[PDB]
Structures are given as structure tokens and as C-alpha cells.
Amino acid sequence: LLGVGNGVLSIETIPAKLINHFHEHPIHQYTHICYEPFNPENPWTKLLLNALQDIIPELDARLWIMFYLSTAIFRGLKEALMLLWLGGGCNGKTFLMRLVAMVLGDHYASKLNISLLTSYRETAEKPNSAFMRLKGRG
Amino acid sequence: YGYFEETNKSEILNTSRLKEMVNPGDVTARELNQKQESFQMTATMVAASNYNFIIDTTDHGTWRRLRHYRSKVKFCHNPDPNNSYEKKEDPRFIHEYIMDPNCQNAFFSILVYFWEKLQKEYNGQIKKVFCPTIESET
DNA sequence: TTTTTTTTTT
Ligand SMILES: Nc1ncnc2c1ncn2[C@@H]1O[C@H](COP(=O)(O)OP(=O)(O)NP(=O)(O)O)[C@@H](O)[C@H]1O
Structure with a gap:
């Protein structure tokens, strides 16, 4: 169950359903994005699809990247995978990565500090709010 | 706006912080007891x-963000008449003409005018400004 | 309030 701007989105069964009516699901966190059914004829959808095609040339690579990023919607246990993306610079890396976090909102997505991944763990017990950002986020 | 001064001899520019402070994207930090x-x-x-500065990287992601300019004129006492790039200094400029409200608001008006000029000439894109000197020095 | 944090130490 995923909270959206115009109700709550249920992805338990395909196709996904939007709950615009009264319900008793205990849901508090949400994103400001208003969910709409996928439509390839929407001008913004066309623009985004063309941008995705431009950023990632290979078809198989594009499909795998879109499949991996789509798992961000689900907030439960998932495959032990991480994606490492290398680029010379000014090649659209941060555009797509930040757009995913923008559309998920702060309650479900967050930028993480690089020192959280390439530095030694703090000695014994010390408070670590950077690691605490990982709670409840997809 | 943010500016830096008080640099030591031959300091090394941390490019990791550079990618993080000049970037149209989110950044993550923490304040005391927060x-x-x-x-x-x-x-x-x-x-x-x-x-x-000492720059130890050559990736396009770094050098696309940097611009370098060298000062030609010098302000001192008894400027050499044979040096066009040497001038008589006026202490008031820092001792008085930085604290007077009138010059402050005049400079603010100049900044607003130049912002309007940038908007109406290059659609707000600073990259489109033509300047051989900055490009050559960089 | 009061404590923990921060500070301080590693
Ligand atoms: N599909 C696209 N078509 C055209 N321009 C694009 C597209 N996607 C992104 N850009 C632009 O390309 C530039 C680079 O985007 P950005 O995501 O910030 O770079 P990056 O690959 O993360 N680079 P860097 O962080 O500097 O190593 C920006 O000016 C974007 O607006």
C-alpha cells in the first residue's frame, strides 16, 4: 500500500487500483504525486520516454535499468542488489536518479551520504542519524 | 551567494566537495543536536x-564546472607611471564605500539591471555568454 | 527538568 497525493495506491494485484473512497488501512506517510494510469500518448510521458531512450541507448540495458528502478515503489524485502553507474560527466546520470527520488517524495526516498559507504564504522556506540535515514524508505 | 577567502599556500581542492556544492540537486548535511x-x-x-588551487583530477565532470580569472591591476601607493596595470588606492572603498547604504543600494540596482540584461539577452543561460578571456585563462 | 549531544577521544 502506497500513499499518493489523490488517495492511496494499492499494488497488491495487477492492475494497480486507486482508492478515492473511505477505507480503514492504517496509512500515514505519503507522496505529493497524484497517481494516474499509464498513458503513452500523454505529452509528458512521450517526453520522458524519449529522454530515457536518449540516456540509455541499448534496449536490454534500458529495460533492466527501468525494471530495477521500478522496485523502489515496493517498501518490503527485495533482492540483494546494488547498481553502480559510471560516466565521464554531463551525461544525464543525476537527472534520472534525482527524478526517481523527486517522484517518491521525502517519506519514501532519500539521498544518502557517500561517507556512509566508503568510511569505517563509528567506534562502538555513537548516534548515527545518516544511517537512520534508511528506515521505511524504498 | 557564498564566497571563500583565507586560502593557504598551494592548498588541494577537494573535488568530491566540489561536485557536491555546485550541482543542481539535493545535498544532505546535519546541524548540531538536529x-x-x-x-x-x-x-x-x-x-x-x-x-x-591544486586539482588532481582530469574528468570532464570536474572541469566543466570551473572557471579561472587572474587579476591584472594592482592598487598601491605611488603607482609606477610606466605600468598601466598599477593604480593609486583609495582606502575609503573598503573603509567607507562598503558600509554606506546609498552605494549598497546603487550596487543592488546594478545587479538587478544586469540580471534583467542576462534574462533578455541569453534566456538566462550563463553558458551562452561570449568571453574569450575567461575561456583562454581556464 | 534533564538528559543526551557535543565534545573528545580514537
Ligand atoms: N534526455 C536529455 N536530453 C537532453 N539533455 C539532457 C537530457 N537529460 C539530461 N540532460 C541535460 O544534461 C545535463 C547533464 O545532466 P546531469 O544529470 O546533471 O548530469 P550527470 O550525468 O549527473 N553529470 P555529472 O554529475 O556532472 O557527472 C543537464 O544540463 C541536463 O539538463
């Missing part, structure tokens, strides 16, 4: 020094 939070990075950066 939790983690993220905010958009929106500051114009200027650095002043008497020594060249």
Missing part, C-alpha cells in the same frame, strides 16, 4: 586567493 535533512543546493560560488 537530525539529518536534505535541501536543494542553490548558492553561487566565488573563491579568491593568491595561490593556484
